[PDB]
Design an enzyme around this catalytic site. Structure first.
Site, PDB file in Angstrom:
ATOM      1  N   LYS A 156       0.855  -1.185   0.000  1.00 53.09           N
ATOM      2  CA  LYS A 156       0.000   0.000   0.000  1.00 53.09           C
ATOM      3  C   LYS A 156       0.889   1.232   0.000  1.00 53.09           C
ATOM      4  O   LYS A 156       1.606   1.482   0.971  1.00 53.09           O
ATOM      5  CB  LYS A 156      -0.922  -0.008   1.230  1.00 53.09           C
ATOM      6  CG  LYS A 156      -2.044  -1.037   1.189  1.00 53.09           C
ATOM      7  CD  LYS A 156      -2.924  -0.957   2.452  1.00 53.09           C
ATOM      8  CE  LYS A 156      -4.298  -1.604   2.264  1.00 53.09           C
ATOM      9  NZ  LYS A 156      -4.404  -2.447   1.040  1.00 53.09           N
TER      10      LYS A 156
ATOM     11  N   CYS B 151      -3.198  -7.609 -17.060  1.00 50.56           N
ATOM     12  CA  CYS B 151      -1.989  -7.996 -16.341  1.00 50.56           C
ATOM     13  C   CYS B 151      -0.767  -8.196 -17.239  1.00 50.56           C
ATOM     14  O   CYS B 151       0.372  -8.252 -16.738  1.00 50.56           O
ATOM     15  CB  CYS B 151      -2.319  -9.318 -15.616  1.00 50.56           C
ATOM     16  SG  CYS B 151      -3.949  -9.390 -14.862  1.00 50.56           S
TER      17      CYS B 151
ATOM     18  N   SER C 259     -14.319   1.025  -8.330  1.00 51.86           N
ATOM     19  CA  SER C 259     -15.657   0.538  -7.916  1.00 51.86           C
ATOM     20  C   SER C 259     -15.727  -0.967  -7.674  1.00 51.86           C
ATOM     21  O   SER C 259     -16.470  -1.365  -6.760  1.00 51.86           O
ATOM     22  CB  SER C 259     -16.649   0.913  -8.963  1.00 51.86           C
ATOM     23  OG  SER C 259     -16.279   0.354 -10.213  1.00 51.86           O
ATOM     24  N   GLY C 260     -15.044  -1.764  -8.489  1.00 50.04           N
ATOM     25  CA  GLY C 260     -15.131  -3.233  -8.446  1.00 50.04           C
ATOM     26  C   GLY C 260     -15.588  -3.693  -9.810  1.00 50.04           C
ATOM     27  O   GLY C 260     -15.204  -4.780 -10.224  1.00 50.04           O
TER      28      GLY C 260
ATOM     29  N   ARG D 164     -11.160 -17.071   4.774  1.00 54.13           N
ATOM     30  CA  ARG D 164     -12.549 -17.016   4.338  1.00 54.13           C
ATOM     31  C   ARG D 164     -12.696 -17.632   2.960  1.00 54.13           C
ATOM     32  O   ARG D 164     -11.893 -17.349   2.065  1.00 54.13           O
ATOM     33  CB  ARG D 164     -13.030 -15.573   4.293  1.00 54.13           C
ATOM     34  CG  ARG D 164     -14.501 -15.457   3.963  1.00 54.13           C
ATOM     35  CD  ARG D 164     -15.043 -14.043   4.134  1.00 54.13           C
ATOM     36  NE  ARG D 164     -16.477 -14.022   3.856  1.00 54.13           N
ATOM     37  CZ  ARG D 164     -17.186 -12.922   3.653  1.00 54.13           C
ATOM     38  NH1 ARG D 164     -16.591 -11.740   3.700  1.00 54.13           N
ATOM     39  NH2 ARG D 164     -18.488 -13.006   3.398  1.00 54.13           N
TER      40      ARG D 164
ATOM     41  N   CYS E  85      -5.748 -16.324  -2.936  1.00 54.98           N
ATOM     42  CA  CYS E  85      -5.964 -15.332  -3.989  1.00 54.98           C
ATOM     43  C   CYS E  85      -4.953 -14.200  -3.826  1.00 54.98           C
ATOM     44  O   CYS E  85      -4.723 -13.735  -2.711  1.00 54.98           O
ATOM     45  CB  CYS E  85      -7.369 -14.744  -3.921  1.00 54.98           C
ATOM     46  SG  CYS E  85      -8.728 -15.948  -3.821  1.00 54.98           S
ATOM     47  N   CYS E  86      -4.356 -13.746  -4.925  1.00 49.14           N
ATOM     48  CA  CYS E  86      -3.476 -12.595  -4.801  1.00 49.14           C
ATOM     49  C   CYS E  86      -4.330 -11.377  -4.504  1.00 49.14           C
ATOM     50  O   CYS E  86      -5.512 -11.312  -4.861  1.00 49.14           O
ATOM     51  CB  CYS E  86      -2.610 -12.390  -6.067  1.00 49.14           C
ATOM     52  SG  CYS E  86      -3.456 -11.703  -7.466  1.00 49.14           S
TER      53      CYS E  86
END
Ligand SMILES: CC(C)(COP(=O)(O)OP(=O)(O)OC[C@H]1O[C@@H](n2cnc3c(N)ncnc32)[C@H](O)[C@@H]1OP(=O)(O)O)[C@@H](O)C(=O)NCCC(=O)NCCS
Ligand SMILES: [Cl-]
Ligand SMILES: [Mg+2]
Ligand SMILES: [Zn+2]
Ligand SMILES: [Zn+2]
Lengths: 392, 134, 392, 133
Positions: A19, A85, A121-122, A194, A205-206
């Protein structure tokens, strides 16, 4: 792509991944500066072209990167590239093509991205409702989960086998300061994280991350003029797009990874059993496991045995994800494909300290895909084959 | 918008006979090269635009599937989706009706209709799904 | 960029421009198919590389375009490119480079965008998402408007003078079915349309449009192999990045357009007074007027005389914006750079019917920039010089 | 849930805590003498060593535009400008005042005020320029 003349990598650059509160341009500039300084460049305008990969920051990312180095202008044609990617690897590929064809003698590829500073947003990470699988509720983790379920059905692999990919990759990253997540994580921690889409749990998952890397490439004569001590030869590089059809596929295979890697072996004259380290598109644990087979490191159906036998970690046939993979760095879309190359170069040069592969690798391969509308496995695939280019 | 969003997907893939006959999936076969595919403007193999409509089998086979616990925004979780292979050698992506932890690879399944999502007017879009036979 | 061998344009493709309900992939596919049909390409396996420009739709635009054509696969490397408004021209440039270098003998460049299905109206485009000027409310309308305010201040030119650009460009587009806006409009109607960013009124601003265009390029032998009757020769093509600094530059000049056009003249061996038609980045009326001087069509201080004397319309030295320019087509960011080239080709070929330039042009130039980066007038610039390539 | 900025930006706008008059900050490269706004490295010579230079509060409107169609979400109309400082630096900034009142080469003075709403819908206070008496 066949190389019309030899192309070598001089300096590389790499930021810490994770981050960041500085944006894609600052990160990209840090990586570019490192790569230029590592190439012994005293006259920045010796760099005759620049390509920059990005996914969703902006439409002029490479100019935003180079403007703070004073390098924009009539003597630096900058083109930005995208294939989700694949972008950072395609940026390096474009630079290699400029040199190989004699358009330039020295060029640079940068991949950069900052996601976490920005509200995405996703829906930006997914296709539109127009895409038939998306209309019916597809999500990427479930698409790869289906690949894992089919592989478990055919081979008897368990969720614990899949989780060992995260364990291995984080182990590899333990002493790597650039990686984000690293060190020991237990199988039970991975399996008990999860559930997203069975059998993919969160730790398989990355994640999204911010980072950048850069690669300077040049001719043989330019390596001699720059005094480069350990030029890394580009033995081959291949870009493909993914075939579209609606026939049953064996999703434990990967049509475009299979054909791209085979073309890379044919053009470079280096086969898969000669590859000493490999960085690949480990967006999910199951992907790395399948790609052992898809790339010909082992036979069809043998990826589970390859993993369990330790053939993809230190001491094995091929150390896979020695920097830690996307599962340890996270995945800034435009950066990963360039970052794989930067770390493979450092490994070939013996420079990775506590995460350095021993004995020193001589052949390093890299792989990113990207995208994938309905009826395709992926939209793109870019692979590079790199070899030690210095004598004794 | 007071012009409505769609409530059905899709007239060129899922045939709902107006006389009440049982719905069926349909493909279209290229008359030049013989490639079967779902409806497309031109054959992706030979670029012909001349086709024949082929009704497809209502029975298929789960090639793979996944129980989705974190899925698309706006869809009720958990849900299930799968690759369902038809004997005409076409693969259909579809939701599966039923409960998590009950499907297996290579299980036989049958076409059915149901809501796959809510539309922009918050009304269901009806489309094809597959369900267990027994 | 110097071309190492001759490169020719075979078929071109163009959608109508304006508010589309079909998305960027459909528009792009339509233009690409039109270009292939115009090249006597009747099979998906003939083109050898593809480049696709886009601004804001997608990270895999070209794979989305070619998916339904059955052309994605191991023999079609697709790379997508971005440099804001330069992207459609950069896609053609990349295709040209593949051919000129011998990497391919037959390639395609596509530019495509759909804006209107993905945004709300009532707002202007900002500068780059990460840019400091964007923080302070920068919009591209006002960024160009500031150039007009300064130009008026320094020369005494009035808003009615600037309005003549719209009048002329719309006149040129009168009989062009691809344009969005066209036909007769008076200076008074232009000046009395609603103010957008003083002194730019609505009718002096390019539309936010959807559309696509495509250009097939190949070697001299490939033109013959395909039976191309009117191959258009690429006489030159140049890409630059814009100088960056925070000093008080004269914004009535244009550093990168000046240097890019000079380099194009030098590499092509064709001077500005030899250019018969020109499609340039007329995003606002002021841009075209300034570029008459920046590109050397006339002497310093004569830009407005050049306009008033008719030298940029039918019968003059150079018909500028014969298709109608961005002020008639509107401007889909990823498409315009390719669309300029498609229409220039058609004009060279005598194929533009009621908007055909007479005498038939032999030399056609095009220009797109790309901006939003603070301290640069433009982040990028791409210009093509095209000439008749069939003998008589 | 961590809050959005309410001030832009400490690297370019200094607000003396003593209550002294705010000022824009430039930086001079110690190696080559180039003056610029804050950077990590000098665009001219790539040095990383600088001295902070308080800049003139007075400037000149080089150009401006009255904005009637803004960015998504911004109230309209507003005004922005290139403001040129005696130190030969150009600042992009909003201008305080009314549409149809500014002129090129007009002298203006630094002032603080809101430039936009932040994601918590609180004003972001930043640098603007205004007319002088
Ligand atoms: C000038 C601008 C702000 C106007 O957009 P807007 O105010 O939101 O207008 P709308 O989209 O709502 O359209 C209103 C009507 O005017 C017309 N219209 C829209 N834009 C127009 C334009 N630029 N010129 C002429 N007419 C226009 C439309 O046809 C429309 O009617 P419709 O509903 O039948 O389609 C917008 O066109 C713009 O920003 N242009 C510059 C774009 C730009 O900067 N590009 C990058 C350059 S580098
Ligand atoms: Cl621009
Ligand atoms: Mg230099
Ligand atoms: Zn066919
Ligand atoms: Zn300096």
């Amino acid at each position: 792509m066949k190389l019309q003349r030899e192309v070598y990598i001089a300096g590389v650059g790499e930021t810490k991944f994770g981050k960041h509160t500085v944006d894609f341009d600052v990160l990209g500039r840090e990586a570019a500066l490192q790569a230029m300084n590592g190439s012994n460049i005293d006259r920045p305008d010796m760099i005759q072209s620049a390509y920059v990969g990005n996914g969703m920051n902006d439409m002029t990312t490479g100019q935003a990167v180079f403007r703070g180095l004073g390098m924009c202008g009539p003597n630096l044609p900058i083109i930005n590239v995208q294939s989700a990617c694949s972008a950072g690897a395609m940026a390096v590929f474009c630079a290699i093509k400029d040199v190989a064809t004699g358009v330039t003698d020295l060029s640079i590829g940068v991949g950069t991205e900052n996601h976490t500073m920005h509200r995405q947003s996703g829906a930006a990470f997914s296709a539109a409702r127009s895409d038939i699988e998306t209309m019916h509720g597809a999500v990427m983790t479930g698409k790869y989960a289906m690949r894992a379920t089919r592989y478990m059905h055919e081979t008897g692999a368990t969720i614990e086998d899949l989780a060992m990919i995260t364990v291995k990759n984080r182990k590899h990253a333990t002493h790597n300061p650039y990686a984000w997540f690293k060190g020991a994580i237990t199988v039970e921690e991975v399996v008990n994280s999860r559930m997203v889409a069975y059998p993919m749990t969160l730790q398989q998952c990355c994640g999204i991350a911010d980072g950048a890397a850069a690669v300077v490439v040049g001719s043989k004569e330019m390596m001699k003029k720059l005094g480069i001590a350990k030029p890394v030869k580009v033995a081959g590089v291949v870009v493909e797009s993914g075939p579209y059809h609606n026939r049953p596929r064996d999703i434990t295979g990967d049509d475009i990874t299979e054909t791209t890697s085979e073309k890379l072996y044919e053009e470079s004259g280096i086969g898969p059993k000669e590859v000493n380290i490999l960085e690949l598109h480990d967006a999910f644990t199951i992907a790395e496991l399948l790609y052992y087979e898809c790339m010909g490191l082992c036979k069809k159906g043998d990826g589970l045995k390859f993993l369990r036998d330790g053939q993809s970690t230190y001491g094995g046939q091929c150390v896979v994800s020695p920097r830690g993979g996307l599962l340890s760095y996270g995945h800034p879309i435009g950066a990963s494909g360039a970052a794989q190359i930067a770390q493979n170069v450092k490994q070939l040069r013996g420079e990775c300290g506590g995460y350095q592969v021993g004995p020193t690798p001589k052949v390093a391969m890299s792989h990113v895909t990207g995208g994938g509308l309905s009826g395709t496995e992926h939209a793109a695939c870019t692979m590079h084959m790199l070899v030690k280019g210095w004598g004794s | 918008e007071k012009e409505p969003d769609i409530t059905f997907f899709h007239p060129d893939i899922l045939e709902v006979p107006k006389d009440g006959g049982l719905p069926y999936l349909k493909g279209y076969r290229c008359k030049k090269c013989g490639q079967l595919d779902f409806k497309t403007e031109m054959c992706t193999n030979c670029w012909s635009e001349e086709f024949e409509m082929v009704p497809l089998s209502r029975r298929g086979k789960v090639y793979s599937f996944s129980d989705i616990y974190i899925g698309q925004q706006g869809l009720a979780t958990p849900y299930i989706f799968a690759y369902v292979d038809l004997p005409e050698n076409l693969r259909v992506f579809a939701q599966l009706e039923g409960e998590v932890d009950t499907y297996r690879c290579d299980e036989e399944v049958e076409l059915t209709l149901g809501p796959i999502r809510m539309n922009n007017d918050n009304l269901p879009i009806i489309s094809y799904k597959f369900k267990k036979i027994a």
